[PDB]
């Protein structure tokens, strides 16, 4: 449920 | 050949087809050269997406286990449980798989700050994902490699990168959730992303022109977790 | 066991495993019984997400290729023909799969006027994605296949199913979309869609509590097309 | 671009 970094 | 690589890399991104796109991108990898900044992130984007598809897969089989944990069916448990086994398999491979590209192939080549702090933050990356699932001593292990590669990321970017790099964020961004989700340790996470905002909000004439947006949203995800967090 | 193989198909779709969830479904099919509606829906969306990645991975390699057909650029439409061609195979072999399911197991275990409907339909289904990307003798014979199990779905609909039911209207819209995309006859398209819809409206006091929703949705699709196509 | 019957 934390953000990590995104990716795309 | 590394150009054709690269293009049928992104044809197979075009048509949602990750697992070719890692083929392609692990050959480019397998060359032993410095990686272009768009061959570190093609690649870096074939594996997020073929791992973040079982991650999902996981997430999902692993709640309607807990539901079932109190309902206690027991047939249903059985075939839960063999079918949640069936994607650790498939997690633990993928891992491997980009762990073995890294090892052998990636970092050793990498010679630049950019290069190395993205490796080792890739490699932080996938023993952090091998934690998500693993038990006993697996999990302890997957832990201990996952905070040596992300110490290693965290040594190169402290030293080579300004702290609103990009890659720099990224990683203070990544590191922080090992803390806060394997390591169970909300007090060094908020510590590790409140620290890492503010020297980049300390230091913001260092934006890049070519990155300014991506250091924006990892900055905009470090505050979105410490508000979860807190 | 049947139960058994229902609860993993299950399990595969929340985890948007569909290649598992095709295994099960078929492995169910495979024991020549009249499959409840439940285990039909099951059997349909499995092998519908199955196809539909590939179909959607096709149109878009498909439009790549059209640029670059218009910047006349050869070494990169050589990479794209190929790698159509491959996506191409992989729908042949899904297409295949499913149409032997049909011909040796639903179609001659079937023995209700809606099962009966709903296999032919997915023979025609099936033929007509083989006929989306075929050419020449492949595309005629695709073709042939699809108009003659449309018409087997519809000589029972028109016979067996209220204007209103469901499936009956699914087979008019997908029918119609037949005529007019692999067919190329608007005007047949038109006629059919309309018809179905007109049918449909006079007779709305054959909806079903089971299925109103359904059969509301696919009247706006019919009027939807029939936008489209005038 | 035409629409056929929905799947889910």
């Known amino acids: 449920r934390s953000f990590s970094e995104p990716f795309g | ?230």
């Open chain 2, 1 to 230: 050949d590394r150009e054709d690589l690269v293009y049928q890399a992104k044809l197979a991104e075009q048509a949602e087809r990750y697992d070719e796109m890692v083929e392609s991108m692990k050959k480019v990898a397998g060359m032993d050269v410095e990686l272009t900044v768009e061959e570190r992130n093609l690649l870096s984007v074939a594996y997020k997406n073929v791992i973040g598809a079982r991650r999902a897969s996981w997430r999902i089989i692993s709640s309607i286990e807990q539901k079932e944990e109190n309902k206690g069916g027991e047939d249903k448990l059985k075939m839960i449980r063999e079918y949640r086994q069936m994607v650790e398999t498939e997690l633990k491979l993928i891992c491997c798989d980009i762990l073995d590209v890294l090892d052998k192939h990636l970092i050793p080549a990498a010679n630049t700050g950019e290069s190395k702090v993205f490796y080792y933050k890739m490699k932080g990356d996938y023993h952090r994902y091998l934690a998500e699932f693993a038990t006993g001593n697996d999990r302890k292990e997957a832990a201990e490699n996952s905070l040596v590669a992300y110490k290693a990321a965290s040594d190169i970017a402290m030293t080579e990168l300004p702290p609103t790099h990009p890659i720099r964020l990224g990683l203070a961004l990544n590191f922080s959730v090992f803390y806060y989700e394997i390591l169970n340790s909300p007090d060094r996470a908020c510590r590790l992303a409140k620290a890492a905002f503010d020297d980049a909000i300390a230091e913001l004439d260092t934006l890049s022109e070519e990155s300014y947006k991506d250091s924006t949203l990892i900055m905009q995800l470090l505050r979105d977790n410490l508000t979860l967090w807190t």
